[PDB]
Symmetry: C3
Subunit: 295 residues, 3 copies
């Protein structure tokens, strides 16, 4: 048995096919079994239309034995492209061994595994090309930026939602196709634990719209709009400001700005560093929750 | 010597360059020596225009020693993108070791080798991404679907027609560029043995045109037209039927339908499973040969 | 530590980020430390606009420690996409171990390393797909053709200018993104030694414009124009001639013609082989320098 062939066969029983069908449509994706009680993690864009129109869509999970079982949506986060499904009273489930994405290093050989019984599924191979790389992701759901694992293994429709696997057959990331990018497993563990526990995930918000700017004076995220009543208006952030640092994270562009805001604590004061007409101004903002009732 | 470098040098003498030239055109591809009598396998689209216009095209085979020898066409199958060439009275030919594509597994490391003396030839590396994957292939020749080996190694103009090689330096597939796909070697061995022996290959036909459909009622290949006097008209297949199984093979789309029909026996009765206005109807059809005189 | 992870960490300190900024623009690339006195090699298109407008652009080199140091341009060759930068009075520099690209073979595993602190940098993995492959490269600088190492590792904006690394952590090529191609290290060593020593590099010229032609009569580079007073006019080269050999190198297309001319000696007589209306004519041309004052 080949070295990658061995690793792929070991995780195959943990990867499932997710089929969402209507009367005149269908959609397939991949998923990962992360808990023996039937908890399945996929990315949000696989199930997005079934969540926005649950009256006309049916979502089933197809195991690698050919077994087809109905699925129920526990929760979903469009801001990290993550979702949690639940199959009830299924026994002898082979659960995936989750790893530590903080122990991953550039050059490590990886496998991007898709669901074996998927229609046009794929298993691709490569190395980790970059770590902590902000990447923008684009139905009626919002566009977001994740701080992702980059790989030269092909991520596509056939392995999206499946796991990124290290050479110890451990899940280190969730492939997303929304050249290849994956959601780190530690990020996935937080979002999934919150979605199982509450059915929702509350992310910080500041009320700022930004664009990217890079020159010899100051480089970062230029404020394009400040919302009314927002924490930014209360903190002093003005339009045409250039945010260069959000909390303890430097901001090189509007994409890293989105990631750094989600790393702030809700309700706690935070430093925001800004270049205003050639002067460095340090502002203090208190992030608000994006969902007040669920929080 | 590197691990892939060793395998590539071992098969290099078995891979040849195929050049087809006219008075105002040219075309190059790759080929594989499969028999010591001078039998060379390539894919049909490398030589297609030389076969349709033999009066104005000259086809030569260039070995890896720089030796250039005229070639003659034994036969070609546009439905599997395969062709067989013959060089006469060439000695000390290094023949490729053919493998068993039924012993190939997802994750196995492969090499897509092109002709070393080709103008813009390539040697690429990857793994087997999927097995038994139907893929459509598109001059005056017909479009077809093959049940192929999928790989994340790049298949392109520089290695099309050359071999897909396992880590034992064995040919397990024929690269075709008509992300990467290859014709399984067992499929290649059937087509080539028939083309050497008769100069033709007779494939089954039913007389059906189909399109792909996928919803919550029934998913498969929707009948778009039934030809007159066809086996389908005699068997009861009607338009707007949805074929879900052809013989012993389930059909998920019009592409798998084309592959499954070619797996039927000519002249023997076969079951065809159909969803007609919400009712499952099982029909019996007898496949006809696509070429009656050559059969 | 993984096998590629080990090699990548060993060369990381030798790879630097090159940032060129203006008042309303910026540009980043990668570079390689090749000499302890502060000599950095990148490709010409990373710094092209800073060289054509030095009054409005500032070029800095960012080491992997976070240290930012101003850089000065020693020289640049647009015809090989190579450039040499100099940082002054920087100590404890980890210099890259340069290899021999003549000892490289098809199938050898390689790494295309980018600057670790680069904004959107990449480390990709593959094999050498082809050797001595002419590839055309396209601001106000000239388009050129280099005789390059081809690899199936992805070369992109994140690793352009960085090194192509073998499994002994040795630089065997310079990645250029102007599927993947790299400048051989032996070619790089000549150009860099001349650029350090004189600040310029003098390449041969003949005064010919060519296009590619391939048919059954003769294949090669068809003369599209002969410049006045050029060495070609003095040697007898006429328009619509087909150059098939330049010196000791055969010419299959206009791209190999550009490479072969740069391999001739300046001021020495050279054979040029031409097909003129069905007759093979052997001409003698004396290459001129492209820069007479710097030579």
């Amino acid at each position: 048995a080949g070295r990658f062939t061995k690793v792929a066969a070991a995780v195959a029983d943990s990867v499932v096919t997710i089929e969402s069908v209507s009367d005149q449509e269908g959609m397939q994706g991949s998923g990962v079994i992360v808990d023996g009680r039937g908890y399945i993690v996929t990315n949000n864009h696989v199930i997005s239309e079934a969540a926005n129109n649950p009256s006309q869509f049916k979502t089933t999970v197809v195991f690698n034995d050919g077994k087809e079982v109905p699925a129920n949506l526990v929760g979903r986060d469009p801001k990290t492209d993550l979702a949690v499904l639940k199959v009830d009273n299924v026994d002898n489930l082979t659960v995936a061994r989750l790893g530590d994405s903080s122990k991953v290093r550039v050059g490590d050989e990886v496998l991007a595994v898709g669901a074996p019984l998927g229609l046009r599924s794929t298993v691709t191979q490569g190395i980790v090309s970059a770590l902590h790389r902000p990447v923008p992701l684009a139905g009626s759901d919002t566009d977001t930026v994740i701080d992702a694992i980059q790989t030269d293994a092909s991520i596509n429709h056939g392995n999206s939602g499946g796991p990124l696997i290290d050479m110890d057959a451990q899940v280190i990331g969730i492939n997303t196709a929304g050249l290849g990018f994956a959601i780190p497993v530690n990020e996935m563990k937080l979002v999934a634990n919150s979605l199982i526990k509450d059915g929702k995930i509350v992310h910080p918000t500041l009320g700022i719209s930004t664009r990217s700017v890079s020159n010899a004076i100051a480089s970062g995220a230029q404020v394009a709009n400040v919302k009314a009543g927002s924490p930014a208006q209360k903190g002093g952030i003005l339009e045409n400001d250039v945010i260069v640092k959000v909390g303890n994270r430097a901001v090189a562009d509007s994409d890293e700005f989105v990631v750094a805001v989600r790393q702030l604590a809700i309700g706690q004061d935070a430093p925001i560093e800004v270049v205003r007409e050639g002067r460095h101004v340090t502002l203090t903002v208190k992030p608000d929750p994006d969902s007040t009732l669920e929080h």
